[PDB]
Amino acid sequence: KKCIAKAILKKAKKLLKKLVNP
Numbered sequence: 001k002k003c004i005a006k007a008i009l010k011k012a013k014k015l016l017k018k019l020v021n022p
Contacts (some may be wrong), residue, residue: 016022
């Protein structure tokens with residue numbers, strides 16, 4: 001598995017939420 005890849009993944013999600021917040 002990828003630790004760095006998994007980290008950014010979770011960030012990308014919450015990121016769109018904090019801003020867009022669908």
